[PDB]
Amino acid sequence: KKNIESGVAHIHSTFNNTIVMITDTHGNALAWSSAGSLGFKGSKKSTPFAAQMAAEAATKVAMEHGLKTVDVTVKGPGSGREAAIRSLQATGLEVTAIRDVTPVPHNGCRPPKRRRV
Amino acid sequence: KVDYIAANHIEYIDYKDTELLKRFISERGKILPRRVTGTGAKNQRKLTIAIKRARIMGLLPFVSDE
Amino acid sequence: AIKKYKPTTNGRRNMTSSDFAEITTSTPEKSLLQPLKNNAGRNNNGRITVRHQGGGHKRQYRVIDFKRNKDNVAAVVKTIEYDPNRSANIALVHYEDGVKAYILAPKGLEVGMRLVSGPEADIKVGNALPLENIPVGTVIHNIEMKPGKGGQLIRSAGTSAQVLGKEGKYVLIRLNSGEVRMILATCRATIGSVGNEQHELINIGKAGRSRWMRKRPTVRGSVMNPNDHPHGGGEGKTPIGRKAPVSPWGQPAIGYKTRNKKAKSDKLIVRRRTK
Protein backbone atom coordinates (compact mmCIF):
# COMPACT_ATOMS: atom_id res chain seq x y z
CA LYS A 1 0.00 0.00 0.00
CA LYS A 2 0.83 3.71 -0.39
CA ASN A 3 4.18 3.10 -2.23
CA ILE A 4 6.51 3.76 0.69
CA GLU A 5 9.37 3.28 -1.84
CA SER A 6 12.21 3.46 0.74
CA GLY A 7 13.09 2.36 4.24
CA VAL A 8 15.58 0.52 6.42
CA ALA A 9 15.77 -3.22 7.14
CA HIS A 10 17.22 -4.89 10.23
CA ILE A 11 19.54 -7.89 10.62
CA HIS A 12 20.23 -9.60 13.95
CA SER A 13 22.28 -12.80 14.02
CA THR A 14 23.19 -14.77 17.13
CA PHE A 15 25.22 -17.96 17.31
CA ASN A 16 21.97 -19.92 17.18
CA ASN A 17 19.43 -17.73 15.31
CA THR A 18 19.20 -14.93 12.78
CA ILE A 19 16.17 -12.66 12.31
CA VAL A 20 15.30 -10.01 9.70
CA MET A 21 12.72 -7.21 9.92
CA ILE A 22 12.02 -4.45 7.38
CA THR A 23 10.75 -1.02 8.42
CA ASP A 24 9.73 2.34 6.97
CA THR A 25 11.98 5.37 6.80
CA HIS A 26 11.59 5.71 10.58
CA GLY A 27 10.11 2.95 10.71
CA ASN A 28 7.03 1.01 11.65
CA ALA A 29 7.31 -2.72 11.10
CA LEU A 30 6.20 -3.88 7.65
CA ALA A 31 7.10 -7.59 7.54
CA TRP A 32 9.71 -9.75 9.24
CA SER A 33 11.18 -13.23 9.01
CA SER A 34 13.45 -15.50 10.99
CA ALA A 35 15.44 -18.64 10.41
CA GLY A 36 13.08 -20.39 12.80
CA SER A 37 10.05 -18.72 11.23
CA LEU A 38 10.50 -20.66 7.98
CA GLY A 39 10.10 -23.97 9.81
CA PHE A 40 13.62 -24.66 11.08
CA LYS A 41 14.93 -25.84 14.43
CA GLY A 42 17.63 -25.29 16.98
CA SER A 43 21.12 -25.78 15.62
CA LYS A 44 20.34 -25.24 11.95
CA LYS A 45 19.44 -21.57 12.39
CA SER A 46 23.19 -20.84 12.42
CA THR A 47 23.67 -21.49 8.71
CA PRO A 48 24.07 -18.74 6.09
CA PHE A 49 21.62 -20.66 3.85
CA ALA A 50 18.66 -20.24 6.21
CA ALA A 51 19.60 -16.56 6.46
CA GLN A 52 19.30 -16.37 2.67
CA MET A 53 15.89 -17.97 2.44
CA ALA A 54 14.48 -16.04 5.41
CA ALA A 55 15.72 -12.69 4.09
CA GLU A 56 14.23 -13.44 0.68
CA ALA A 57 10.91 -14.51 2.22
CA ALA A 58 10.89 -11.17 4.02
CA THR A 59 11.56 -9.26 0.78
CA LYS A 60 8.70 -11.04 -1.01
CA VAL A 61 6.13 -9.50 1.33
CA ALA A 62 8.19 -6.29 1.58
CA MET A 63 7.94 -5.40 -2.10
CA GLU A 64 4.25 -6.30 -2.26
CA HIS A 65 3.67 -2.96 -0.52
CA GLY A 66 5.83 -0.64 -2.61
CA LEU A 67 9.55 -0.72 -2.01
CA LYS A 68 12.66 -0.33 -4.16
CA THR A 69 15.61 0.84 -2.04
CA VAL A 70 16.60 -0.08 1.50
CA ASP A 71 19.37 0.48 4.02
CA VAL A 72 20.64 -2.31 6.21
CA THR A 73 20.89 -2.27 10.00
CA VAL A 74 23.05 -5.12 11.31
CA LYS A 75 23.11 -6.10 14.95
CA GLY A 76 24.00 -9.53 16.21
CA PRO A 77 27.60 -10.59 15.57
CA GLY A 78 27.11 -14.04 14.07
CA SER A 79 27.75 -16.04 10.92
CA GLY A 80 25.05 -15.73 8.23
CA ARG A 81 24.73 -11.95 8.49
CA GLU A 82 26.55 -11.48 5.18
CA ALA A 83 24.46 -14.04 3.27
CA ALA A 84 21.38 -12.21 4.55
CA ILE A 85 22.64 -9.00 2.89
CA ARG A 86 23.73 -10.71 -0.30
CA SER A 87 20.50 -12.67 -0.81
CA LEU A 88 18.70 -9.44 0.11
CA GLN A 89 20.47 -8.08 -2.96
CA ALA A 90 19.38 -11.12 -4.95
CA THR A 91 15.58 -10.98 -5.25
CA GLY A 92 15.12 -7.37 -6.28
CA LEU A 93 16.24 -4.64 -3.90
CA GLU A 94 18.55 -1.65 -4.28
CA VAL A 95 20.68 -1.60 -1.11
CA THR A 96 22.49 1.73 -1.12
CA ALA A 97 24.09 2.06 2.34
CA ILE A 98 24.99 -0.43 5.07
CA ARG A 99 25.44 0.53 8.73
CA ASP A 100 26.69 -2.28 10.97
CA VAL A 101 25.86 -0.99 14.44
CA THR A 102 26.41 -3.43 17.28
CA PRO A 103 27.09 -1.18 20.25
CA VAL A 104 30.12 -1.54 22.48
CA PRO A 105 29.74 -0.41 26.10
CA HIS A 106 32.48 1.40 27.92
CA ASN A 107 32.94 -1.25 30.64
CA GLY A 108 29.84 -0.61 32.70
CA CYS A 109 28.50 -4.08 33.45
CA ARG A 110 29.90 -7.54 33.89
CA PRO A 111 29.49 -10.55 31.61
CA PRO A 112 28.28 -13.76 33.28
CA LYS A 113 30.29 -16.72 34.62
CA ARG A 114 32.89 -17.44 31.99
CA ARG A 115 31.87 -20.92 30.97
CA ARG A 116 33.61 -24.22 31.78
CA VAL A 117 32.89 -26.72 29.02
CA LYS B 1 63.26 9.14 14.28
CA VAL B 2 59.62 9.35 13.23
CA ASP B 3 58.66 13.00 13.07
CA TYR B 4 56.72 14.21 16.09
CA ILE B 5 54.46 17.23 15.66
CA ALA B 6 56.50 19.37 18.06
CA ALA B 7 58.82 20.72 15.37
CA ASN B 8 56.97 23.97 15.90
CA HIS B 9 57.84 25.47 19.27
CA ILE B 10 54.34 25.33 20.72
CA GLU B 11 54.36 24.72 24.47
CA TYR B 12 50.74 24.92 25.61
CA ILE B 13 48.46 22.89 23.34
CA ASP B 14 45.89 25.77 23.27
CA TYR B 15 43.02 23.36 24.17
CA LYS B 16 40.81 24.19 21.16
CA ASP B 17 42.97 24.19 18.00
CA THR B 18 41.07 21.73 15.85
CA GLU B 19 43.77 22.03 13.19
CA LEU B 20 46.24 20.81 15.83
CA LEU B 21 43.83 18.13 17.01
CA LYS B 22 42.18 16.14 14.20
CA ARG B 23 45.49 14.47 13.27
CA PHE B 24 45.33 12.15 16.29
CA ILE B 25 41.76 10.87 15.97
CA SER B 26 40.32 8.22 13.74
CA GLU B 27 37.83 8.89 10.97
CA ARG B 28 35.38 7.03 13.19
CA GLY B 29 36.45 9.07 16.21
CA LYS B 30 38.82 7.10 18.47
CA ILE B 31 42.36 8.04 19.54
CA LEU B 32 45.28 7.13 17.37
CA PRO B 33 48.12 5.47 19.32
CA ARG B 34 51.54 6.94 19.98
CA ARG B 35 53.40 4.48 17.75
CA VAL B 36 51.02 5.37 14.93
CA THR B 37 51.55 9.12 15.15
CA GLY B 38 55.14 8.85 16.38
CA THR B 39 55.51 11.35 19.20
CA GLY B 40 57.09 11.62 22.62
CA ALA B 41 55.41 10.17 25.68
CA LYS B 42 54.33 13.38 27.39
CA ASN B 43 52.70 14.90 24.31
CA GLN B 44 50.60 11.76 23.90
CA ARG B 45 49.34 12.34 27.44
CA LYS B 46 48.77 16.06 26.91
CA LEU B 47 46.71 15.42 23.77
CA THR B 48 44.80 12.67 25.58
CA ILE B 49 43.72 14.94 28.44
CA ALA B 50 43.13 17.81 25.98
CA ILE B 51 40.62 15.91 23.91
CA LYS B 52 39.06 14.34 27.01
CA ARG B 53 38.27 17.92 27.99
CA ALA B 54 37.20 18.61 24.42
CA ARG B 55 34.74 15.71 24.26
CA ILE B 56 32.47 17.11 26.98
CA MET B 57 31.77 20.63 25.66
CA GLY B 58 30.56 19.37 22.29
CA LEU B 59 33.73 20.43 20.50
CA LEU B 60 34.14 16.84 19.24
CA PRO B 61 31.80 13.83 19.04
CA PHE B 62 31.97 10.73 21.17
CA VAL B 63 30.55 8.20 18.69
CA SER B 64 30.11 8.72 14.94
CA ASP B 65 27.63 6.18 13.61
CA GLU B 66 24.52 8.25 12.82
CA ALA C 1 24.63 12.87 69.34
CA ILE C 2 23.63 9.90 71.52
CA LYS C 3 24.47 9.19 75.14
CA LYS C 4 24.97 5.63 76.34
CA TYR C 5 24.39 5.36 80.06
CA LYS C 6 26.62 2.96 81.93
CA PRO C 7 24.64 -0.02 83.20
CA THR C 8 24.12 0.56 86.90
CA THR C 9 20.64 -0.88 87.48
CA ASN C 10 18.68 -3.22 85.25
CA GLY C 11 16.35 -0.53 83.90
CA ARG C 12 19.35 1.42 82.77
CA ARG C 13 21.27 -1.35 80.91
CA ASN C 14 20.16 -0.32 77.46
CA MET C 15 19.10 3.29 77.70
CA THR C 16 19.98 5.90 75.10
CA SER C 17 19.04 9.55 74.73
CA SER C 18 20.28 12.58 72.91
CA ASP C 19 22.81 15.16 73.98
CA PHE C 20 20.61 18.16 73.27
CA ALA C 21 23.73 19.79 71.89
CA GLU C 22 22.02 21.81 69.16
CA ILE C 23 19.74 23.56 71.64
CA THR C 24 20.97 27.00 72.60
CA THR C 25 18.55 28.27 75.24
CA SER C 26 15.89 27.02 77.64
CA THR C 27 13.47 29.95 77.86
CA PRO C 28 10.42 30.31 75.62
CA GLU C 29 8.69 33.66 75.20
CA LYS C 30 5.41 34.71 76.71
CA SER C 31 3.91 35.92 73.46
CA LEU C 32 3.89 32.60 71.61
CA LEU C 33 2.64 30.17 74.26
CA GLN C 34 -0.95 28.97 74.39
CA PRO C 35 -2.47 26.37 76.74
CA LEU C 36 -3.41 22.77 76.03
CA LYS C 37 -5.49 20.00 77.49
CA ASN C 38 -4.88 16.37 77.57
CA ASN C 39 -7.65 14.38 76.04
CA ALA C 40 -6.82 10.72 76.68
CA GLY C 41 -8.72 10.15 73.44
CA ARG C 42 -12.20 11.15 74.61
CA ASN C 43 -14.92 12.82 72.55
CA ASN C 44 -17.57 15.39 73.05
CA ASN C 45 -19.54 12.40 74.28
CA GLY C 46 -16.63 11.40 76.49
CA ARG C 47 -15.79 7.92 75.28
CA ILE C 48 -12.54 6.32 74.23
CA THR C 49 -12.04 6.52 70.48
CA VAL C 50 -8.32 6.13 69.85
CA ARG C 51 -7.03 3.73 72.46
CA HIS C 52 -3.90 4.02 74.59
CA GLN C 53 -3.57 7.73 75.33
CA GLY C 54 -3.18 10.13 78.22
CA GLY C 55 -1.42 10.16 81.53
CA GLY C 56 1.83 12.11 81.30
CA HIS C 57 3.50 15.44 81.85
CA LYS C 58 2.28 18.98 81.03
CA ARG C 59 2.64 20.76 77.70
CA GLN C 60 1.80 24.06 75.99
CA TYR C 61 1.43 25.37 72.46
CA ARG C 62 4.22 27.14 70.72
CA VAL C 63 2.57 28.93 67.81
CA ILE C 64 4.62 28.18 64.71
CA ASP C 65 4.38 29.57 61.18
CA PHE C 66 3.37 27.48 58.24
CA LYS C 67 2.57 30.29 55.80
CA ARG C 68 5.45 32.82 55.79
CA ASN C 69 3.57 35.55 54.04
CA LYS C 70 5.63 38.51 55.26
CA ASP C 71 7.80 38.68 52.18
CA ASN C 72 10.59 41.05 51.11
CA VAL C 73 11.61 41.54 54.77
CA ALA C 74 14.70 39.85 56.18
CA ALA C 75 14.66 37.84 59.39
CA VAL C 76 17.28 36.98 62.03
CA VAL C 77 17.31 33.57 63.75
CA LYS C 78 18.54 33.42 67.35
CA THR C 79 17.51 30.24 69.20
CA ILE C 80 16.88 26.52 68.70
CA GLU C 81 14.45 24.96 71.15
CA TYR C 82 11.95 22.19 71.85
CA ASP C 83 8.56 21.28 71.16
CA PRO C 84 7.23 18.49 73.33
CA ASN C 85 4.65 18.33 70.55
CA ARG C 86 6.87 17.96 67.54
CA SER C 87 9.86 15.76 67.01
CA ALA C 88 11.76 18.65 65.50
CA ASN C 89 13.77 21.58 66.80
CA ILE C 90 12.27 25.01 66.38
CA ALA C 91 13.74 28.50 66.04
CA LEU C 92 12.79 32.03 67.08
CA VAL C 93 12.71 34.68 64.38
CA HIS C 94 13.09 38.45 64.69
CA TYR C 95 11.60 40.25 61.74
CA GLU C 96 13.12 43.66 61.18
CA ASP C 97 9.63 45.12 61.47
CA GLY C 98 9.67 43.99 65.10
CA VAL C 99 7.48 40.91 64.84
CA LYS C 100 8.24 37.56 66.44
CA ALA C 101 7.09 34.00 65.70
CA TYR C 102 8.73 30.60 65.49
CA ILE C 103 9.94 28.67 62.44
CA LEU C 104 10.60 24.96 61.91
CA ALA C 105 14.37 24.67 61.88
CA PRO C 106 15.97 22.43 59.27
CA LYS C 107 19.54 21.16 59.12
CA GLY C 108 22.35 23.64 58.71
CA LEU C 109 20.74 26.66 60.38
CA GLU C 110 23.18 28.69 62.44
CA VAL C 111 22.42 31.61 64.70
CA GLY C 112 22.85 34.79 62.69
CA MET C 113 21.54 33.67 59.33
CA ARG C 114 18.89 35.62 57.46
CA LEU C 115 15.92 33.92 55.83
CA VAL C 116 14.07 35.63 52.96
CA SER C 117 10.65 34.44 51.84
CA GLY C 118 9.55 36.33 48.73
CA PRO C 119 8.49 34.94 45.36
CA GLU C 120 11.98 35.59 44.00
CA ALA C 121 14.21 35.08 47.03
CA ASP C 122 17.52 33.28 46.71
CA ILE C 123 17.87 29.54 47.07
CA LYS C 124 19.56 28.50 50.29
CA VAL C 125 18.58 26.62 53.43
CA GLY C 126 15.54 28.13 55.12
CA ASN C 127 13.99 30.28 52.42
CA ALA C 128 10.32 30.07 51.42
CA LEU C 129 9.38 30.11 47.73
CA PRO C 130 6.28 29.27 45.72
CA LEU C 131 6.75 26.00 43.84
CA GLU C 132 6.91 27.64 40.40
CA ASN C 133 10.17 29.40 41.11
CA ILE C 134 11.96 26.39 42.60
CA PRO C 135 14.26 24.78 40.00
CA VAL C 136 14.61 21.07 39.36
CA GLY C 137 16.18 18.81 41.95
CA THR C 138 16.05 20.41 45.40
CA VAL C 139 15.06 19.24 48.87
CA ILE C 140 11.87 20.72 50.24
CA HIS C 141 9.50 20.96 53.22
CA ASN C 142 6.31 22.55 54.53
CA ILE C 143 4.62 21.94 51.19
CA GLU C 144 1.21 23.53 51.05
CA MET C 145 -1.49 21.26 49.72
CA LYS C 146 -3.90 24.08 48.82
CA PRO C 147 -2.76 27.68 48.45
CA GLY C 148 -3.28 29.72 51.59
CA LYS C 149 -3.47 27.13 54.36
CA GLY C 150 0.14 26.83 55.29
CA GLY C 151 2.12 23.63 55.18
CA GLN C 152 0.66 20.18 55.75
CA LEU C 153 3.09 17.86 54.00
CA ILE C 154 6.47 16.80 55.16
CA ARG C 155 7.21 18.31 58.57
CA SER C 156 8.77 15.91 61.05
CA ALA C 157 12.33 14.97 61.83
CA GLY C 158 14.98 13.88 59.39
CA THR C 159 12.69 13.69 56.38
CA SER C 160 12.86 15.14 52.86
CA ALA C 161 11.34 15.33 49.36
CA GLN C 162 12.43 16.20 45.80
CA VAL C 163 11.18 17.86 42.64
CA LEU C 164 10.94 15.41 39.76
CA GLY C 165 9.53 17.53 36.97
CA LYS C 166 7.43 20.59 36.31
CA GLU C 167 4.50 20.68 33.96
CA GLY C 168 2.46 23.70 32.95
CA LYS C 169 0.14 22.37 35.57
CA TYR C 170 0.82 20.65 37.95
CA VAL C 171 4.23 20.27 39.67
CA LEU C 172 5.47 16.73 40.29
CA ILE C 173 7.06 15.88 43.65
CA ARG C 174 8.60 12.74 45.10
CA LEU C 175 7.41 12.48 48.69
CA ASN C 176 8.78 10.12 51.25
CA SER C 177 7.71 6.48 51.15
CA GLY C 178 8.37 6.41 47.42
CA GLU C 179 5.30 8.18 46.04
CA VAL C 180 4.87 10.70 43.22
CA ARG C 181 2.17 13.36 43.39
CA MET C 182 0.72 16.13 41.23
CA ILE C 183 0.61 19.36 43.29
CA LEU C 184 -0.56 22.86 42.27
CA ALA C 185 2.16 25.32 41.39
CA THR C 186 0.99 28.22 43.56
CA CYS C 187 1.90 26.50 46.83
CA ARG C 188 4.62 27.49 49.29
CA ALA C 189 7.56 25.38 50.45
CA THR C 190 10.95 25.58 52.15
CA ILE C 191 14.39 24.42 51.06
CA GLY C 192 16.31 21.86 53.08
CA SER C 193 15.61 18.91 55.32
CA VAL C 194 14.47 18.81 58.95
CA GLY C 195 16.79 18.77 61.96
CA ASN C 196 17.06 15.78 64.33
CA GLU C 197 17.99 12.66 62.41
CA GLN C 198 18.09 10.26 65.26
CA HIS C 199 14.65 9.53 66.72
CA GLU C 200 14.93 5.99 65.42
CA LEU C 201 18.23 5.70 67.29
CA ILE C 202 16.87 6.03 70.84
CA ASN C 203 16.15 3.18 73.19
CA ILE C 204 13.39 4.24 75.51
CA GLY C 205 14.57 1.67 78.03
CA LYS C 206 12.20 1.67 80.99
CA ALA C 207 8.50 1.22 80.79
CA GLY C 208 8.29 4.52 82.60
CA ARG C 209 10.01 6.59 79.97
CA SER C 210 7.54 5.61 77.27
CA ARG C 211 4.93 6.06 79.98
CA TRP C 212 6.13 9.65 80.42
CA MET C 213 5.24 10.20 76.82
CA ARG C 214 1.49 9.98 76.89
CA LYS C 215 1.12 6.24 76.26
CA ARG C 216 -0.49 3.27 78.01
CA PRO C 217 0.02 -0.51 77.91
CA THR C 218 -1.59 -2.45 75.07
CA VAL C 219 -2.80 -5.95 75.86
CA ARG C 220 -2.24 -8.75 73.35
CA GLY C 221 -5.38 -9.69 71.48
CA SER C 222 -5.31 -13.41 72.10
CA VAL C 223 -5.35 -13.05 75.88
CA MET C 224 -8.78 -11.42 76.07
CA ASN C 225 -11.88 -13.39 76.92
CA PRO C 226 -13.80 -14.22 73.70
CA ASN C 227 -16.34 -11.42 74.14
CA ASP C 228 -14.07 -8.40 73.99
CA HIS C 229 -11.98 -9.65 71.08
CA PRO C 230 -12.49 -12.23 68.34
CA HIS C 231 -9.08 -13.88 68.77
CA GLY C 232 -9.66 -14.64 72.42
CA GLY C 233 -10.58 -17.59 74.55
CA GLY C 234 -8.96 -20.97 74.30
CA GLU C 235 -7.49 -23.15 77.02
CA GLY C 236 -3.74 -22.98 77.15
CA LYS C 237 -1.98 -20.91 74.57
CA THR C 238 -3.80 -21.19 71.26
CA PRO C 239 -2.83 -20.20 67.74
CA ILE C 240 -5.10 -17.91 65.81
CA GLY C 241 -7.85 -20.34 65.00
CA ARG C 242 -9.45 -17.91 62.59
CA LYS C 243 -8.31 -17.45 59.02
CA ALA C 244 -6.73 -14.01 58.33
CA PRO C 245 -5.90 -12.38 61.72
CA VAL C 246 -8.36 -9.72 62.74
CA SER C 247 -8.43 -6.39 64.56
CA PRO C 248 -11.06 -6.19 67.36
CA TRP C 249 -13.69 -4.66 65.05
CA GLY C 250 -13.59 -6.97 62.06
CA GLN C 251 -11.25 -5.69 59.28
CA PRO C 252 -8.40 -8.21 58.80
CA ALA C 253 -5.11 -6.69 59.81
CA ILE C 254 -2.57 -7.98 57.29
CA GLY C 255 -3.75 -7.27 53.77
CA TYR C 256 -6.54 -4.70 53.36
CA LYS C 257 -5.78 -1.66 51.36
CA THR C 258 -8.25 0.84 52.81
CA ARG C 259 -7.92 3.76 50.43
CA ASN C 260 -11.49 4.67 49.55
CA LYS C 261 -11.95 3.43 46.02
CA LYS C 262 -13.68 6.57 44.75
CA ALA C 263 -11.20 9.11 46.05
CA LYS C 264 -10.97 12.54 44.45
CA SER C 265 -7.25 12.34 43.75
CA ASP C 266 -6.55 9.27 41.60
CA LYS C 267 -5.87 11.57 38.65
CA LEU C 268 -3.01 13.02 40.68
CA ILE C 269 -1.46 10.01 42.39
CA VAL C 270 1.22 8.06 40.53
CA ARG C 271 2.82 4.92 42.06
CA ARG C 272 1.91 4.49 45.72
CA ARG C 273 5.10 2.62 46.33
CA THR C 274 5.27 1.69 50.03
CA LYS C 275 1.95 1.68 51.88
Binding site: - | G58, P61 | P135
Partner: protein, 97 residues
Protein backbone atom coordinates in the same frame (compact mmCIF):
# COMPACT_ATOMS: atom_id res chain seq x y z
CA UNK D 1 49.73 34.48 44.27
CA UNK D 2 46.61 33.76 42.23
CA UNK D 3 45.48 31.20 39.64
CA UNK D 4 44.44 31.94 36.05
CA UNK D 5 41.09 30.64 34.80
CA UNK D 6 39.13 30.04 31.65
CA UNK D 7 35.42 30.01 32.42
CA UNK D 8 33.62 29.12 29.19
CA UNK D 9 29.87 28.59 29.19
CA UNK D 10 27.25 27.79 26.58
CA UNK D 11 24.29 30.11 26.08
CA UNK D 12 20.96 29.29 24.40
CA UNK D 13 20.36 30.42 20.80
CA UNK D 14 16.74 31.52 21.19
CA UNK D 15 17.32 34.23 23.81
CA UNK D 16 17.38 37.93 22.91
CA UNK D 17 20.62 39.88 22.77
CA UNK D 18 19.71 42.28 25.58
CA UNK D 19 19.36 39.24 27.84
CA UNK D 20 22.87 38.26 26.73
CA UNK D 21 24.32 41.53 28.01
CA UNK D 22 22.28 41.32 31.23
CA UNK D 23 23.49 37.76 31.82
CA UNK D 24 27.13 38.68 31.17
CA UNK D 25 26.93 41.63 33.56
CA UNK D 26 25.19 39.53 36.22
CA UNK D 27 27.92 36.90 36.27
CA UNK D 28 30.62 39.55 36.11
CA UNK D 29 29.06 41.15 39.19
CA UNK D 30 28.95 37.85 41.06
CA UNK D 31 32.63 37.45 40.23
CA UNK D 32 33.60 40.99 41.24
CA UNK D 33 31.87 40.81 44.63
CA UNK D 34 33.79 37.87 46.06
CA UNK D 35 37.36 39.07 45.58
CA UNK D 36 38.10 38.21 41.96
CA UNK D 37 40.32 40.38 39.78
CA UNK D 38 38.67 40.18 36.39
CA UNK D 39 41.13 40.79 33.54
CA UNK D 40 39.66 39.95 30.17
CA UNK D 41 36.49 38.65 28.55
CA UNK D 42 35.57 37.90 24.94
CA UNK D 43 32.78 36.17 23.06
CA UNK D 44 34.13 33.12 21.28
CA UNK D 45 31.79 32.11 18.42
CA UNK D 46 28.24 31.28 17.37
CA UNK D 47 28.78 27.55 17.03
CA UNK D 48 26.69 24.42 16.70
CA UNK D 49 27.14 21.30 18.83
CA UNK D 50 28.77 18.00 17.88
CA UNK D 51 25.80 16.20 19.55
CA UNK D 52 22.50 17.33 21.02
CA UNK D 53 22.61 18.34 24.66
CA UNK D 54 19.21 19.13 26.17
CA UNK D 55 17.04 19.66 23.12
CA UNK D 56 19.48 22.04 21.49
CA UNK D 57 22.08 21.74 18.74
CA UNK D 58 23.51 25.28 18.75
CA UNK D 59 24.98 27.60 21.33
CA UNK D 60 26.64 30.94 21.94
CA UNK D 61 30.15 30.74 23.33
CA UNK D 62 31.59 33.30 25.73
CA UNK D 63 34.82 33.21 27.74
CA UNK D 64 35.73 35.15 30.88
CA UNK D 65 39.17 35.19 32.45
CA UNK D 66 39.89 35.87 36.10
CA UNK D 67 42.51 35.44 38.81
CA UNK D 68 41.85 35.12 42.54
CA UNK D 69 43.48 33.77 45.69
CA UNK D 70 42.66 30.12 46.29
CA UNK D 71 41.26 30.76 49.76
CA UNK D 72 38.62 33.11 48.36
CA UNK D 73 35.23 31.73 47.42
CA UNK D 74 35.06 33.66 44.16
CA UNK D 75 34.40 30.47 42.20
CA UNK D 76 31.81 28.58 44.24
CA UNK D 77 29.39 31.47 43.91
CA UNK D 78 29.72 30.94 40.16
CA UNK D 79 29.35 27.16 40.48
CA UNK D 80 26.18 27.38 42.54
CA UNK D 81 24.49 29.86 40.22
CA UNK D 82 25.49 28.71 36.74
CA UNK D 83 24.07 25.18 36.89
CA UNK D 84 20.71 26.30 38.28
CA UNK D 85 19.88 28.56 35.33
CA UNK D 86 17.86 28.05 32.16
CA UNK D 87 20.17 29.54 29.54
CA UNK D 88 23.63 28.35 30.60
CA UNK D 89 23.91 24.74 29.50
CA UNK D 90 27.41 23.84 30.69
CA UNK D 91 30.47 25.67 32.00
CA UNK D 92 34.06 24.57 32.58
CA UNK D 93 36.76 26.03 34.82
CA UNK D 94 40.42 25.19 34.13
CA UNK D 95 43.74 26.36 35.55
CA UNK D 96 45.52 28.33 32.81
CA UNK D 97 49.28 27.99 32.46
Amino acid sequence: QDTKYEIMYIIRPNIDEEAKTALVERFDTILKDNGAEVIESKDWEKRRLAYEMNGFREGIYHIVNVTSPSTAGAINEFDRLAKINDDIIRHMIVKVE
